[PDB]
Amino acid sequence: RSRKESYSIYVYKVLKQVHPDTGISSKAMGIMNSFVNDIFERIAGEASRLAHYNKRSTITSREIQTAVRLLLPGELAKHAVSEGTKAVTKYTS
Amino acid sequence: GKARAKAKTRSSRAGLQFPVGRVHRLLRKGNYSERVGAGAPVYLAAVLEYLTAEILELAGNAARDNKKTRIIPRHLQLAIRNDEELNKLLGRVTIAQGGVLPNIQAVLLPK
Amino acid sequence: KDPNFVHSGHGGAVAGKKNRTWKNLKQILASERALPWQLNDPNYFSIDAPPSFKPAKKYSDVSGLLANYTDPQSKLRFSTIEEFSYIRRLPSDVVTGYLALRKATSI
Amino acid sequence: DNIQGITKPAIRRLARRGGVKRISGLIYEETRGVLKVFLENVIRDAVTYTEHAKRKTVTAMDVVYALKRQGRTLYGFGG
Amino acid sequence: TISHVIIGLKTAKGTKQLKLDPSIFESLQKERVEAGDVIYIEANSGAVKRQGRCDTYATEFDLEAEEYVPLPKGDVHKKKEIIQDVTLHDLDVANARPQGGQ
Amino acid sequence: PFRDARAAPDPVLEAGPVAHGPLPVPLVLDNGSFQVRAGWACPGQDPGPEPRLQFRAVCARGRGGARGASGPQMLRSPFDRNVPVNLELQELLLDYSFQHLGVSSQGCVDHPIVLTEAVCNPLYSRQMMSELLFECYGIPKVAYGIDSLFSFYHNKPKNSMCSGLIISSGYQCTHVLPILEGRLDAKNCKRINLGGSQAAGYLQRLLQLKYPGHLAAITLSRMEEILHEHSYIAEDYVEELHKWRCPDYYENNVHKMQLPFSVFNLAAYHQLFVGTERIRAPEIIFQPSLIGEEQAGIAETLQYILDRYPKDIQEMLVQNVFLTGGNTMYPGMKARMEKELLEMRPFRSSFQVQLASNPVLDAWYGARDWALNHLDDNEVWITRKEYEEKGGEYLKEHCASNIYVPIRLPKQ
Amino acid sequence: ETEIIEGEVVEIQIDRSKVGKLTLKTTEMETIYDLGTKMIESLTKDKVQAGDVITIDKATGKISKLGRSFTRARDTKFVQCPDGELQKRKEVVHTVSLHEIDVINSRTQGFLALFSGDT
């Protein structure tokens, strides 16, 4: 009939990966869905503006890496760049 | 002929848990640019997945310290407002039904 | 003049949005793996030597001398105290350069 | 020395454009600290834009984009 | 599941396979020997000595509780004619009280 | 110091070196990804007196398309993994060869050709190459074979069936080729994805990271001097580099490489000191884990491809370990290889490590001798006409060539 | 000639066979090590913690803990971190009386009878 397109199973899989004892109330799932959707809109919006400023038709890993470098704070940006480069490293083999 | 049965995901090839194909799907249908890189959604998924791992670990520590193991919006708010990095990332947002971090001013404390 | 002038097309085509001049080596391999092979048949995808049976030595990145050590910060391999004094003075660019030269944790 | 280039009478001039009647003697160097961290927060984003753009002269666009992102925008430099 | 043990030995002078009986292998097992250890076997007497791990494996981990030794530069297999001097009193004393074996 | 570069020679000759006895004189060519060698077979001396066209296999054109180039003078190359993998960028290399060596009368090459190929050739590339030979140049009969086994055929005592390991060292790949009863045992042959190109690239990347004060002053054409002249391969690498550690042995063995001259003197003209770097680039083929890449290397391959044979035929097929190609030019290469082989062989057992007479040239001399000796073996050569009836990938089962395997390739 | 590790342990992590990763420091350098099983079963056995100073005979994995670093004495021997590089080859010179070789050879564990007079 109708759809919502939530991240629910992925955020829950990540929870069991960091803390195997821990669980989610659906009210907290609502927080996480709102959060990850908003951060996606922030990064994709930053990357879109950044690509248009640079007159490109494309966003690539360097547009998004720079957009993340703008959006994120101190140590979380350092770790986010570390995981973003690790993922692209183990994907490209 | 026919396409591949049980063809491996971009996510599991990257070693990620987040839906890299959906990240590409949403970057393209979300109209952010007219063309989108193949490793762009890998990097983006890995960042969203990292932020998700960090915020949930701190929330699970907040739950453990609160004598609980089901996350509720309170544990996320406690994590986000204890950590300065999440706090300064998340200044323009309210965690619904998470309340506020408990704080008494030094002038209001005893004697 | 020339060894010939009446050449003709033998694989490269101007049409579409595809290669005008060659077939890439990975395409040559991927389209060969489809043929009706048997285990006796000498094959260009099968000649790659095994991964090593003993583990790889740590040679120091900055000098090639044997590395008893790896740095928690830069993640390079180093042999001596003056090499540690040297690597902590390198710019990040050459550090990720040395790591990429060993397919390690940066690009 | 470079940070002291924010001169002691410049603090008084800026605060006098800011309408204030009188300045306490401790204001000056910590206000250079506020100007420093503000400058630093915009300049680092501008360099972050400039590095993605491959260039290494910091452009008026690089700092306009940093100020636009940080909601401290300006007009007159070709936005 | 038991008969006898083939073992391979290597040095910077070559390689051999030996055909150890199970009563030798009981000592390799008691010495906690595995593939890649450096070993001395005395074939007359079953004196088996572990001598540490071969240093080609000295990077199996970055730091592990084994001494690592270089692959022997000597021959894999040494014969000497030797002469044992043993008094009748050694035979008496080594038999009259139940031996250590311990 | 560095030498100055040399290029753009004038080896131009008449229609062809026609001779007494046989009217047909074949072209002899050696093949792959570094440097062409070519010439007419020319019977008349037991050693080949004049191989020609010893030139870097690199291709170019002017930015407006008004002129092209192919002889030695950024650029392009028709190769990867030592297999030809381009169309017209390969044709212009053949053109340059025939145009310098001689054109006899018309729009075809005069006489038959011997043409080396990769240890295996993929079942498209030999076909595409033969098609780019027959339709474009009309050669009357053709001989495919392998550079390494040709260099062995020259270095054999006599025209005979024999056995060996050919340790080849091509520009991109090092291959270990067990050969039995005169033929490649291609069923259990193996290769390492590394060679001269990777060693030169590594030696570049080391010195680029070591001297950012002049990233532009070091380049592949300068790396080839320190690689083909000043480098050497260790007897035991952990022992050579341990001996390298002490300052007095360092100052005695580090090589000065004075950049082209106009802080005492060196401020823009540094000496690019190479030490352990002059070992590391050589060692890549023995230990590919000096790069990121996990592979058995030229030592553990020589174990793994050998212990799979019966205990007695190993002693027979090791009786010619034969060393050939580009990297095998390093001083100490035979010494390393026999010092290594001494560990992995049975304790008393014999072996011989035969280095080629000239590790870079001998594949051409071998192809010359094979074409001179087999000149009229019409079961060995592929005749022009056979391309119309066979699958084009087809080859005829003979010494110094890959084992054939019957296959059909469609066209639509 | 003996191979001895000697440093402040900066950080130490263990998973769930076992794998773990350990970091060591001198006043002059820092290092990280992937541990082998027979070190994990020693570092865990001797309850080693971040800010300890430890000396390890590498051939045996006995942890000679020397104390804790003065910055992690906060919240009872306290000591400066070791100097030079972490892994030193050092000569140990050792003197055994000829009688002390007589005794070690005489029982299942002879050396106890050296102290106790039992032999």
XYZ file of N, CA and C in Angstrom, chain B residues 18-105:
264
model
N 26.008 -0.446 5.796
C 25.053 0.488 5.183
C 24.813 0.203 3.688
N 23.640 0.554 3.126
C 23.252 0.220 1.751
C 23.883 1.155 0.705
N 25.119 0.879 0.277
C 25.875 1.722 -0.672
C 25.105 1.945 -1.976
N 24.423 0.915 -2.476
C 23.570 1.038 -3.655
C 22.448 2.054 -3.457
N 21.775 2.033 -2.299
C 20.766 3.038 -1.938
C 21.367 4.426 -1.801
N 22.571 4.543 -1.248
C 23.260 5.832 -1.177
C 23.456 6.389 -2.588
N 23.895 5.569 -3.548
C 23.972 5.974 -4.958
C 22.591 6.313 -5.548
N 21.574 5.485 -5.258
C 20.163 5.646 -5.664
C 19.615 7.002 -5.226
N 19.832 7.347 -3.962
C 19.381 8.585 -3.342
C 20.229 9.787 -3.749
N 21.538 9.645 -3.963
C 22.340 10.747 -4.504
C 21.844 11.136 -5.903
N 21.541 10.144 -6.748
C 21.083 10.377 -8.123
C 19.629 10.854 -8.196
N 18.678 10.177 -7.539
C 17.266 10.618 -7.519
C 17.024 11.859 -6.643
N 17.865 12.101 -5.639
C 17.861 13.329 -4.835
C 18.348 14.581 -5.580
N 18.713 14.448 -6.858
C 19.049 15.546 -7.764
C 20.280 16.384 -7.350
N 21.134 15.896 -6.444
C 22.283 16.650 -5.921
C 23.329 17.005 -6.990
N 23.553 16.127 -7.965
C 24.284 16.417 -9.206
C 23.781 15.516 -10.332
N 23.936 15.946 -11.580
C 23.445 15.205 -12.747
C 24.225 13.905 -13.030
N 25.450 13.768 -12.506
C 26.258 12.535 -12.528
C 26.871 12.275 -11.144
N 27.079 11.015 -10.753
C 27.589 10.632 -9.419
C 28.614 9.494 -9.491
N 29.767 9.677 -8.846
C 30.871 8.713 -8.780
C 30.498 7.376 -8.132
N 31.150 6.289 -8.547
C 30.869 4.942 -8.045
C 31.410 4.685 -6.621
N 32.548 5.294 -6.260
C 33.125 5.262 -4.906
C 32.609 6.365 -3.970
N 31.960 7.404 -4.503
C 31.310 8.445 -3.709
C 30.325 7.878 -2.663
N 29.365 7.003 -3.028
C 28.453 6.419 -2.055
C 29.148 5.444 -1.104
N 30.264 4.810 -1.489
C 31.059 3.979 -0.565
C 31.596 4.855 0.555
N 32.249 5.957 0.189
C 32.805 6.893 1.155
C 31.701 7.466 2.051
N 30.595 7.924 1.457
C 29.480 8.492 2.207
C 28.865 7.478 3.175
N 28.583 6.263 2.706
C 28.074 5.194 3.552
C 29.034 4.905 4.707
N 30.341 4.839 4.452
C 31.327 4.604 5.498
C 31.338 5.705 6.566
N 31.148 6.968 6.176
C 31.057 8.090 7.121
C 29.772 8.020 7.943
N 28.624 7.815 7.298
C 27.349 7.665 7.998
C 27.382 6.462 8.949
N 27.963 5.349 8.511
C 28.171 4.149 9.312
C 29.122 4.396 10.491
N 30.226 5.122 10.289
C 31.125 5.505 11.376
C 30.424 6.389 12.419
N 29.732 7.445 11.982
C 28.997 8.320 12.892
C 27.946 7.523 13.670
N 27.254 6.613 12.985
C 26.292 5.692 13.591
C 26.948 4.788 14.638
N 28.116 4.212 14.353
C 28.828 3.376 15.311
C 29.232 4.173 16.562
N 29.822 5.354 16.376
C 30.278 6.207 17.471
C 29.113 6.667 18.368
N 28.042 7.201 17.770
C 26.919 7.762 18.526
C 26.180 6.674 19.306
N 26.034 5.482 18.720
C 25.409 4.353 19.390
C 26.305 3.762 20.478
N 27.625 3.695 20.290
C 28.541 3.270 21.354
C 28.436 4.195 22.574
N 28.461 5.512 22.362
C 28.302 6.457 23.462
C 26.907 6.352 24.094
N 25.850 6.157 23.302
C 24.513 5.935 23.841
C 24.424 4.632 24.650
N 25.066 3.556 24.203
C 25.120 2.291 24.933
C 25.910 2.409 26.233
N 27.005 3.174 26.240
C 27.681 3.545 27.482
C 26.746 4.350 28.392
N 26.007 5.323 27.854
C 25.031 6.066 28.641
C 23.942 5.138 29.214
N 23.444 4.173 28.440
C 22.489 3.184 28.917
C 23.081 2.307 30.032
N 24.283 1.748 29.834
C 25.011 0.944 30.833
C 25.176 1.709 32.144
N 25.640 2.950 32.058
C 25.837 3.830 33.212
C 24.506 4.211 33.881
N 23.422 4.297 33.107
C 22.043 4.463 33.576
C 21.378 3.147 34.051
N 22.107 2.021 34.078
C 21.616 0.684 34.466
C 20.532 0.127 33.520
N 20.702 0.316 32.207
C 19.800 -0.097 31.109
C 20.590 -0.674 29.925
N 19.926 -1.348 28.986
C 20.541 -1.850 27.734
C 19.684 -1.627 26.482
N 18.396 -1.306 26.604
C 17.587 -0.722 25.531
C 17.884 0.775 25.433
N 18.402 1.226 24.294
C 18.542 2.651 23.992
C 17.154 3.295 23.918
N 17.021 4.439 24.582
C 15.904 5.384 24.477
C 16.477 6.777 24.191
N 15.699 7.730 23.647
C 16.203 9.055 23.272
C 17.033 9.758 24.352
N 16.728 9.506 25.630
C 17.510 9.980 26.775
C 18.981 9.588 26.686
N 19.298 8.324 26.425
C 20.687 7.856 26.369
C 21.464 8.518 25.232
N 20.824 8.715 24.078
C 21.407 9.457 22.962
C 21.656 10.914 23.348
N 20.680 11.598 23.946
C 20.871 12.975 24.406
C 22.016 13.072 25.427
N 22.083 12.158 26.401
C 23.175 12.120 27.377
C 24.535 11.951 26.692
N 24.651 11.031 25.734
C 25.867 10.858 24.944
C 26.234 12.129 24.165
N 25.281 12.667 23.405
C 25.485 13.809 22.514
C 25.875 15.065 23.293
N 25.336 15.275 24.500
C 25.643 16.464 25.310
C 26.817 16.279 26.275
N 27.209 15.047 26.607
C 28.488 14.790 27.280
C 29.679 14.989 26.333
N 29.632 14.430 25.122
C 30.693 14.605 24.125
C 30.653 15.995 23.470
N 31.718 16.781 23.611
C 31.825 18.085 22.960
C 31.789 18.004 21.422
N 32.311 16.939 20.807
C 32.362 16.839 19.345
C 30.964 16.614 18.766
N 30.217 15.638 19.290
C 28.805 15.498 18.956
C 28.008 16.752 19.341
N 28.237 17.359 20.511
C 27.497 18.559 20.905
C 27.652 19.687 19.872
N 28.881 19.965 19.414
C 29.130 21.035 18.436
C 28.753 20.651 17.001
N 28.688 19.358 16.673
C 28.064 18.876 15.432
C 26.533 19.042 15.455
N 25.920 18.895 16.630
C 24.474 18.759 16.822
C 23.865 19.934 17.617
N 24.351 21.154 17.379
C 23.884 22.365 18.069
C 22.498 22.850 17.624
N 22.136 22.618 16.358
C 20.869 23.068 15.745
C 19.755 22.013 15.789
N 19.825 21.044 16.704
C 18.866 19.928 16.757
C 18.412 19.523 18.163
N 17.141 19.133 18.261
C 16.491 18.589 19.458
C 16.313 17.075 19.340
N 16.746 16.317 20.349
C 16.477 14.877 20.489
C 15.096 14.700 21.142
N 14.059 14.353 20.374
C 12.689 14.337 20.895
C 12.530 13.382 22.088
N 11.879 13.848 23.152
C 11.677 13.130 24.416
C 12.976 12.598 25.063
N 14.135 13.182 24.729
C 15.418 12.934 25.402
C 15.693 13.857 26.599
N 14.877 14.893 26.801
C 15.064 15.886 27.864
C 16.305 16.760 27.652
N 16.916 17.225 28.744
C 18.153 18.030 28.745
C 19.175 17.457 29.731
N 20.467 17.680 29.489
C 21.553 17.233 30.363
C 21.479 17.947 31.734
N 21.523 17.236 32.877
C 21.341 17.843 34.194
C 22.547 18.694 34.601
N 22.300 19.953 34.956
C 23.317 20.972 35.209
C 22.806 22.019 36.204
N 23.524 22.175 37.318
C 23.311 23.236 38.310
C 24.446 24.257 38.173
N 24.125 25.549 38.128
C 25.137 26.611 38.120
C 25.911 26.657 39.450
